[PDB]
Amino acid sequence: PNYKLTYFNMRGRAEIIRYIFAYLDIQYEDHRIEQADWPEIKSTLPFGKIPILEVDGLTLHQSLAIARYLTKNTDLAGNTEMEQCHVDAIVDTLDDFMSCFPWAEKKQDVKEQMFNELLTYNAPHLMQDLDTYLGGREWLIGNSVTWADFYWEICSTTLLVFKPDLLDNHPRLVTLRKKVQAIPAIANWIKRRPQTKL
Amino acid sequence: PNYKLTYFNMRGRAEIIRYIFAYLDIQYEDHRIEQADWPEIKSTLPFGKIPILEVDGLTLHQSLAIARYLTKNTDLAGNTEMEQCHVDAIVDTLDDFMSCFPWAEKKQDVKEQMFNELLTYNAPHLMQDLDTYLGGREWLIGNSVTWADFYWEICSTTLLVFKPDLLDNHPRLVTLRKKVQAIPAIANWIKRRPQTKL
Numbered sequence A, B: 001p002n003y004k005l006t007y008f009n010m011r012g013r014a015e016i017i018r019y020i021f022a023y024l025d026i027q028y029e030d031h032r033i034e035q036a037d038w039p040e041i042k043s044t045l046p047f048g049k050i051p052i053l054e055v056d057g058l059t060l061h062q063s064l065a066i067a068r069y070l071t072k073n074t075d076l077a078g079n080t081e082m083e084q085c086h087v088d089a090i091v092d093t094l095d096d097f098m099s100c101f102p103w104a105e106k107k108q109d110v111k112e113q114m115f116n117e118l119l120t121y122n123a124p125h126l127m128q129d130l131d132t133y134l135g136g137r138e139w140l141i142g143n144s145v146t147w148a149d150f151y152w153e154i155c156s157t158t159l160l161v162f163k164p165d166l167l168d169n170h171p172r173l174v175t176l177r178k179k180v181q182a183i184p185a186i187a188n189w190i191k192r193r194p195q196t197k198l
């Protein structure tokens, strides 16, 4: 069908969907809105958030709902129902952490202490948990790449913006990042995508 | 299989899983820990968070991952692939909002202010969106109950504790909570569960 993704000009919460479409070699309109048009566009949305994915003018919302929809019956899904549960669980564990950040914070000091707090104390613990979880396997779940690996590469890319040294002690999480980045369709997208901070 | 759910003595993030087992008429061990015992259990969990659900000796984590797993191939999941997406989206929409609250905040003057801002400035927008979303239909998605309906009733029960007037302008939302609460297996669980604030 006809796919149109609407988001800001950032990776943010649309990037997992952009990776999936890249990987499945599915063409879509990557619509990136002007911030000035935001109040308008927002009053057409089911819940006032983006991203939304229009599928033949049937609207889907909630980036991970959409991601799960798109990967259903693909090799990105997890190879069994329980492995699908582990893929969902890892994704939510990463999302829970990312959602802790006051991304829409006003007081640029209060923001920067919340950030410093989360990055100084919370992120290292998560990195260590993820490194133990991964251990010596190739991918986070099962014997092949799933969208949870994509989500790790996406989340950690943003986290490295604010904390460059995040993985100095975790070469195996770096390896996994570079393996996702090396999958040809993902590599092409990374090279083609707009360069944005977030 | 043999199921063991581990959580605090609280509805909280385990409640959605408890509703699903009640509705599907599935026996499980409802293991409620007290605080004394939490640090020692924590250190054995790969992500240090509960709920967990042990299934024939394998551990699953992340409450919505687990709920989605348990409902796969039941009437609770949604019928079409698109309806499954909408179920996941509504669940995520409710959960994202439940996530803004500083549940852990120990300085209660800052806690109480935050709760109040959220409940006054934010919540009513979401209620309005959910009510418009529901329209005149019996259930959120499709024409039969799904776990999104259960998560609505659960999330709103907790919200109503802090903002008792939350649904005063939303009779269609109150009707939906009452329908979920009238489903006999759910009714019986609500009657019998331990009474806890949250």
Ligand SMILES: COC(=O)Nc1nc2ccc(C(=O)c3cccs3)cc2[nH]1
Pocket: B011, B012, B013, B095, B098, B099, B103, B104, B154, B155, B158, B198
């Ligand atoms: C003294 O206990 C707490 O404040 N902690 C606490 N932890 C909690 C975790 C979850 C919830 C809760 O009601 C939901 C969150 C998402 C859906 S229901 C409420 C909670 N309250």
Ligand SMILES: N[C@@H](CCC(=O)N[C@@H](CS)C(=O)NCC(=O)O)C(=O)O
Pocket: A092, A096, B012, B013, B042, B048, B049, B050, B051, B061, B062, B063, B064
């Ligand atoms: N998104 C997760 C939240 C898990 C979570 O943060 N659980 C809390 C209590 S609801 C917890 O284990 N906190 C205790 C701790 O972190 O030590 C889920 O739904 O399972």
Ligand SMILES: [Mg+2]
Pocket: A092, A095, A096, B092, B095, B096
């Ligand atoms: Mg979430």
